Amino acid sequence: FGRFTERAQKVLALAQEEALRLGHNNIGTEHILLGLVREGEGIAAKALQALGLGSEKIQKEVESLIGRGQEMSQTIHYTPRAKKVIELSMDEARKLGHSYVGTEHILLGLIREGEGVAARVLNNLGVSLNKARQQVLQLLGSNETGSSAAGTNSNANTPTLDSLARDLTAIAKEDSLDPVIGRSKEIQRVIEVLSRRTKNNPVLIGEPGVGKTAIAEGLAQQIINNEVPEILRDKRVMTLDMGTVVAGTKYRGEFEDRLKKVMDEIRQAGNIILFIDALHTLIGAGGAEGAIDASNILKPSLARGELQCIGATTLDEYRKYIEKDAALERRFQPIQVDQPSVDESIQILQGLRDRYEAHHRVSITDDAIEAAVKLSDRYISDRFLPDKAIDLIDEAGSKVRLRSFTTPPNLKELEQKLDEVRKEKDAAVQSQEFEKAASLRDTEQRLREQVEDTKKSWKEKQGQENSEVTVDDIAMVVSSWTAQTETDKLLNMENILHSRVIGQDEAVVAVAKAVRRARAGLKDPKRPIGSFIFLGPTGVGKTELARALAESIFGDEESMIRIDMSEYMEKHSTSRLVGSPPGYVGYDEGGQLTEKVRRKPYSVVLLDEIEKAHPDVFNILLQVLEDGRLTDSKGRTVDFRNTILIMTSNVGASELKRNKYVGFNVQDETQNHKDMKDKVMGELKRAFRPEFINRIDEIIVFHSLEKKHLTEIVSLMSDQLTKRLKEQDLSIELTDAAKAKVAEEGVDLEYGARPLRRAIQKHVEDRLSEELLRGNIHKGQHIVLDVEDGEFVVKTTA
Amino acid sequence: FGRFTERAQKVLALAQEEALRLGHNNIGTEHILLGLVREGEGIAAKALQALGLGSEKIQKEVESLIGRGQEMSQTIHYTPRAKKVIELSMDEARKLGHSYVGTEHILLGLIREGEGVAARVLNNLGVSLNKARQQVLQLLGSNETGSSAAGTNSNANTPTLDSLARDLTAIAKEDSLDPVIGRSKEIQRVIEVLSRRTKNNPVLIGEPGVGKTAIAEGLAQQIINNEVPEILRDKRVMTLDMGTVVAGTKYRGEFEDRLKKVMDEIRQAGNIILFIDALHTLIGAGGAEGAIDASNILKPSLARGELQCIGATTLDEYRKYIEKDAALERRFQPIQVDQPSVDESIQILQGLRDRYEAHHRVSITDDAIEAAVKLSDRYISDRFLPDKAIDLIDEAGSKVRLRSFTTPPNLKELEQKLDEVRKEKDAAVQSQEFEKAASLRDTEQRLREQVEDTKKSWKEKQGQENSEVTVDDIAMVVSSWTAQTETDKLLNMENILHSRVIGQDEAVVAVAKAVRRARAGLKDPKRPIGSFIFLGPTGVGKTELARALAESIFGDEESMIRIDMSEYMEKHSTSRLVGSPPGYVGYDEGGQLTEKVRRKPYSVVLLDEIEKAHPDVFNILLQVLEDGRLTDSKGRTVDFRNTILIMTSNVGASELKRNKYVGFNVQDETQNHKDMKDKVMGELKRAFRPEFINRIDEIIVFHSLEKKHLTEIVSLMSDQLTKRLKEQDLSIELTDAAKAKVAEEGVDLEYGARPLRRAIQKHVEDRLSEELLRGNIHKGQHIVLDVEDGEFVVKTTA
Numbered sequence A, B: 001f002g003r004f005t006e007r008a009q010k011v012l013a014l015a016q017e018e019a020l021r022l023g024h025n026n027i028g029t030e031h032i033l034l035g036l037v038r039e040g041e042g043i044a045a046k047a048l049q050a051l052g053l054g055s056e057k058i059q060k061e062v063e064s065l066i067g068r069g070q071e072m073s074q075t076i077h078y079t080p081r082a083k084k085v086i087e088l089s090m091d092e093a094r095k096l097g098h099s100y101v102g103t104e105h106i107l108l109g110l111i112r113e114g115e116g117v118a119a120r121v122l123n124n125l126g127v128s129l130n131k132a133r134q135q136v137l138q139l140l141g142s143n144e145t146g147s148s149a150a151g152t153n154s155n156a157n158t159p160t161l162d163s164l165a166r167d168l169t170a171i172a173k174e175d176s177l178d179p180v181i182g183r184s185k186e187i188q189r190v191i192e193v194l195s196r197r198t199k200n201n202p203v204l205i206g207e208p209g210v211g212k213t214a215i216a217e218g219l220a221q222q223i224i225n226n227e228v229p230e231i232l233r234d235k236r237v238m239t240l241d242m243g244t245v246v247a248g249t250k251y252r253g254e255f256e257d258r259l260k261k262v263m264d265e266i267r268q269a270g271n272i273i274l275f276i277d278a279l280h281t282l283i284g285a286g287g288a289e290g291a292i293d294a295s296n297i298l299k300p301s302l303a304r305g306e307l308q309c310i311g312a313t314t315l316d317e318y319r320k321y322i323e324k325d326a327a328l329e330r331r332f333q334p335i336q337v338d339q340p341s342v343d344e345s346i347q348i349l350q351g352l353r354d355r356y357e358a359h360h361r362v363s364i365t366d367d368a369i370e371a372a373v374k375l376s377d378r379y380i381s382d383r384f385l386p387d388k389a390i391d392l393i394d395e396a397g398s399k400v401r402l403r404s405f406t407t408p409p410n411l412k413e414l415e416q417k418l419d420e421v422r423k424e425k426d427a428a429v430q431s432q433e434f435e436k437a438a439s440l441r442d443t444e445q446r447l448r449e450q451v452e453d454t455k456k457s458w459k460e461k462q463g464q465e466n467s468e469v470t471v472d473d474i475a476m477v478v479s480s481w482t483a484q485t486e487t488d489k490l491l492n493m494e495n496i497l498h499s500r501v502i503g504q505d506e507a508v509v510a511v512a513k514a515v516r517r518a519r520a521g522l523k524d525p526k527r528p529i530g531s532f533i534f535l536g537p538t539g540v541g542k543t544e545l546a547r548a549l550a551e552s553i554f555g556d557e558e559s560m561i562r563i564d565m566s567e568y569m570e571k572h573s574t575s576r577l578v579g580s581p582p583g584y585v586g587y588d589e590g591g592q593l594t595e596k597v598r599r600k601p602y603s604v605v606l607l608d609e610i611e612k613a614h615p616d617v618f619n620i621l622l623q624v625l626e627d628g629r630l631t632d633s634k635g636r637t638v639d640f641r642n643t644i645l646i647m648t649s650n651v652g653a654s655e656l657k658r659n660k661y662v663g664f665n666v667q668d669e670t671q672n673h674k675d676m677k678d679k680v681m682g683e684l685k686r687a688f689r690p691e692f693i694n695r696i697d698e699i700i701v702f703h704s705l706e707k708k709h710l711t712e713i714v715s716l717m718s719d720q721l722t723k724r725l726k727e728q729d730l731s732i733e734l735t736d737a738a739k740a741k742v743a744e745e746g747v748d749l750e751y752g753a754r755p756l757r758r759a760i761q762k763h764v765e766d767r768l769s770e771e772l773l774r775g776n777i778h779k780g781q782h783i784v785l786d787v788e789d790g791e792f793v794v795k796t797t798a
Helices: A007-024 A028-038 A043-051 A055-063 A078-093 A103-114 A117-124 A129-135 A185-192 A213-224 A243-247 A252-268 A293-305 A342-351 A354-356 A368-376 A385-403 A410-433 A435-455 A456-462 A471-481 A484-491 A495-500 A505-518 A541-552 A584-599 A616-626 A673-682 A710-726 A736-744 A758-774 B007-022 B029-038 B043-051 B056-063 B080-094 B103-112 B119-121 B129-137 B158-162 B185-192 B216-223 B241-248 B252-268 B296-302 B342-351 B364-380 B387-402 B412-431 B435-455 B462-464 B471-481 B486-490 B493-497 B505-517 B542-554 B584-599 B613-627 B672-683 B710-724 B736-743 B756-772
Strands: A201-205 A236-240 A272-277 A307-314 A334-335 A529-536 A605-609 A628-633 A637-638 A644-649 A696-701 A731-734 A782-787 A794-797 B203-205 B236-239 B272-276 B311-312 B332-335 B530-534 B561-564 B606-608 B629-632 B638-639 B642-646 B696-699 B731-734 B784-788 B792-796
Touching: A007 A028, A007 A043, A007 A055, A007 A078, A007 A103, A028 A043, A028 A055, A028 A078, A028 A117, A028 B542, A043 A129, A055 A117, A078 A103, A078 A117, A103 A129, A103 A293, A117 A129, A185 A213, A185 A334, A185 B387, A213 A236, A213 A307, A213 A673, A243 A252, A243 B736, A252 A272, A252 A293, A252 B241, A252 B672, A293 B332, A342 A368, A342 A385, A342 B364, A354 A385, A354 B462, A368 A385, A385 A471, A410 A435, A435 A456, A435 A628, A471 A484, A484 A495, A484 A541, A495 A505, A495 A541, A505 A541, A505 A696, A505 B756, A541 A605, A541 A644, A584 A628, A584 A637, A584 B203, A616 A628, A616 A644, A628 B638, A644 A710, A696 B756, A710 A736, A710 A758, A710 B332, A731 A736, A731 A758, A731 B606, A736 A758, A736 A782, A736 A794, A758 A794, A758 B342, B007 B029, B007 B080, B007 B103, B007 B792, B029 B056, B029 B103, B043 B103, B043 B129, B043 B530, B080 B103, B080 B606, B103 B119, B103 B129, B158 B236, B185 B216, B203 B332, B216 B236, B216 B272, B216 B311, B216 B731, B241 B252, B252 B272, B252 B296, B342 B364, B342 B387, B364 B387, B364 B471, B364 B486, B387 B462, B387 B471, B412 B435, B486 B493, B493 B505, B493 B542, B505 B530, B505 B542, B505 B696, B530 B542, B542 B642, B561 B584, B561 B731, B584 B613, B584 B629, B584 B638, B606 B792, B613 B629, B613 B642, B710 B731, B710 B736, B710 B756, B731 B736, B736 B756, B736 B784, B756 B784, B756 B792
Parallel strands: A201 A307, A201 A334, A236 A272, A272 A307, A529 A644, A529 A696, A605 A644, A731 A782, B203 B311, B236 B272, B272 B311, B530 B642, B530 B696, B561 B606, B606 B642, B731 B784
Antiparallel strands: A628 A637, A782 A794, B629 B638, B784 B792
């Protein structure tokens, strides 16, 4: 593997030595056995010494196979039998914890593969093979955190702790706990509120989403040893774990019975600390429905202080417990739990790096880890800032680790050859045709040593990746899904936003810098990554930048919400037939807008045409842009805190859609362009209040239609066509010249831009499908549609 | 522990004495053992004398396992075995509830921890380890006070009281029942309802939720001694306990059967009292569902006086029983249970004080206790008058006690040092030399004694708090949630409200004065602490005073409800624009207002624009002012304990949202103020009917936009930026010079003072994030935005 211990490796090498000492050309498992007993009193060796085996005794049996002397050091590698015994030992060390592998596992693995060369050595020398595996097993993997013992005494605690549940305190006597991270100052605030015995219940409110449970392990460690008052002396810390409760329970009544039992034993009161994660669920209050109504027993328990407990809730959760009162107000008392401070995230990362050495490429790159956080919060953006983080780490901490064994030097062709050989070889002997297989057989094995030699020349491709988790890598992986290539995304955001939005640079750079500003990692991710107003007509600019922001901001353009404010009027978007209006603005606020962004805290949220809606909608939007949150949909809190809010506007649209027109000359065209990139910022102001527009980071400017838009419509539609031909394979691109010939059947004055579908269909879809049938084009290679002399032409390229 | 018997402590000191008397110098367990047998006939000592161990006999063995001689009297403290034996005694006293650990427990713990020289002494002197702990065990911990009767009886009473459950009367003939103390005046009307035959069932109505259950123990005591009614000198009080019934059961039918059985045994009729907590659940009447319908058996039982029982009910419950009729109301007959009078509260506080001295603190401070009540009633204000109180007492009654153990005087640096020692020492030996650790090792334990010496110099911070609670502290806990720093809050209310409201002192002092009156004791403890109308167009002062009122009035800035009355007219966001579908005023009375204030009964209620509300609304708010309560949302009563009802008005607007303006004179600005601070207090009255407003006291005055009112808005918006940046960990402040450059792009006449947020976005948000991105300012340093010579400058500080 790359995780083994000395003693293991040492028992193994001793085998090769005995192979040759005994004349065995191929180092049998029999020699692995010798290896084990020849390492003397190693965990394997020692085991063998118990069963009654000396290095010699093994070696004689071993010698009775091939025996002295038929070793010229010819093909002195292991036997396939012996190779199996080793593979088993690695797993036999997973078994005994051990991420590495000890001596024992090698003897244990030997036993497992019990009919081999080894096996026979022990089973001939009067040692039952499993009697040997016993003996090794009962001599540990040799992985510990150190230990000691001295015993305790009887105490009241006996009935309780069985049920339900694990106790942090036990595991901390011989420590194995970690802080882990914090959110340290939160732990302190508990002890006033808990060295209380009448509103003695702390209640942590944050978000999921900070690793709330980290703060909890904090308490455990510090409340035992040793700075705690005599108030909270005679302490036990008990966690009430949900998982054991749900198991073996088929109904609500039985679940309640288990909770009742806990409450009865809870008489250990005021000297016991109970940790209840997700506190809200038990109270069962608020909403259309609850979950379970433990509250009846639980409310007096909190008031009495018999249940002296710690509640872990999120943004939304608390409301449905303090609303019941007043043994929630003579219980609960609040404590500040972050909307992640970036640094706290980072520390979690460092802690779990070595275990992504079981996901190899981590431990390290440290620098990449900080980035894991920093790039992730802003680039996907969806999750919570430490999940976000870690995703970059392990992804990148694997992506390249895949690239490790992709080839030899490209001697993958070698392996391919060795196969083909076997066939020939075989089929020839299968007729027999002895030497007509023989030379093929030889050619096979030629290949074989070579294969393995150059597949392990790509141990150099291992040494590259197998502990770097690389900066660029981490960044790349966030960029891949949906430091370097996210900060190249941030710094070069404008470049990325420019490549998708054509014309109106004015808007792009304004957004670019504002998001990039946020994207430093600083601005605070408790409030959107960007607020914006995106001006421009219904045409060209706005949406496209929002999308392009998904690309630049998030890594790929694979996250852009878009909610219409005209639905937030009550009407103008359920007009006549279309849509469902169930109290319609109430539906949008009350559910729709909040639900969508609650799924994706990620995306560029584009709240469309805030012109047509009344100023009242905007007061609501203003909270979204400022607070970074809105609360609706049964009291749920929606994170707009790393969204990019973009509110669009236009009512002068027509002027930005104004034809180029030959008003006298072709410089009426060049007076139509320049004019429209000016005209926009006043079409914003005219249909609604200013108060909203000021929340916005920057005022983004766009414009559209002229003459010259028709051949741009052809370039939107033809690209949707060719992409639906990509879905089940076919790579197409149209050159602009070919889009022109399509437009040629579209400059009807009497039938508008209707003929464009038909001519795009005719020259692209229809033409490609009727060309795939010819064999002119090739599915899965790149197909360029151009006009050359004057007519449309399909050409092919790789 | 920090609480012990003589006997315990005596066994301990004798160990050190024996260390040297025998040649040792470190007290192992051997000296503790010696301690036990040398303490003579304390329960540990006595035990050892029984099993056959003399003081002599122990000390000689002890001495034969080091002793004679190592004598030179090296520092005699424990060693780790010996420390373990002690840890066990603490738990061996917990075991039998001794909160003042006794002799026995030390021998019990010694045995348990039966290793070290002691163990060997005892196992040498013809006593097995368990034979020794047995002897001790079987004689008390020495912490009793129960029993006072040695009588015996058998009577018909047997089947009933068995089942199900206790006998309050017994425990008060054992000298172990407390009154507790209520709610004393509550108990008396019950005794009428208890000597009857018809109407013989009491039903206590209040809030549950006041510690109501105290009144019940009152009865127990009075049924015993000594002048009480004729059947009350022939009555026994037996408790109907829900907990035993539900235990071992999980079917509703079985619960009913058991209740039927209880009624069968109730044949002690006309001489039996059943105590039923939370009476409603059994009756099952009213609501949209039951809770289990005992009524078939229960109703005739209740009316006849074969079940003469005591009901503990709440705000709503009674209504849903007289509706049931006609044996429900026959049985019932009412008694007044208050949310106890200010004085009643106080007595409860004092009564449970010593056990927050078992929660090692309060014991005292008296001024803080009285305050716990008084301050609670007005400051949070989220329960009934005593529940609040006691919570302050223990919270604060720990908060400073937490500060007890967190430093030496400042000799915390010692502990820090002692660490560094371990390291140098360790790593040096860990490589070796021996002596390359040695002097470092030695330096460590030198340090250690110093460390520990000054950590127990911070027993002085224990003697400070371990009978205190602090005034300021109790007050602090009330400030924490939402005497001294709440009555300093009361006294300095004005100062606190002034520091957070800028513009119109008239308003501030007015709220201050009504609240400070109320907050001194005189004013309803169940109606708003201030009802107010807050005048002037939205922009300056109104909300901000409501907030500032939370800070001064409640002790922290938080908890303020806020409902807009202008929506409640059923025509403004009834379905019109962004709100929710209901027929809006019906929703507000029927649910919204009442539910919201029910969560925090203290909340600053801001009923916005009572002017623009329907005249029915004025009645709804008026009902809060009259009753102090509103009853809605399925008959729940919302306690507006010391809410601050704040009714807003946006009128006066034309002058109060004008331009202060140079009218031809620069004294048109300073007369636009003087005019505006006049114009509001007459503009409120015209927009709504008098019937409401007359039960609204102070007329709170505010304005907004001017020349000058504008520049007060700039400083509100810049402050909205700086707080949202704190969550990640960025400390920002704008000095006035930077707020000025921001104003530079928003003193437009053609766009007003709307641009200011936007100009903050470019010059503050955008500038700081682009300054953080360049790293000239940083997280955890205070960042000043100033203007120097007409240009903005971002600085870094500390």
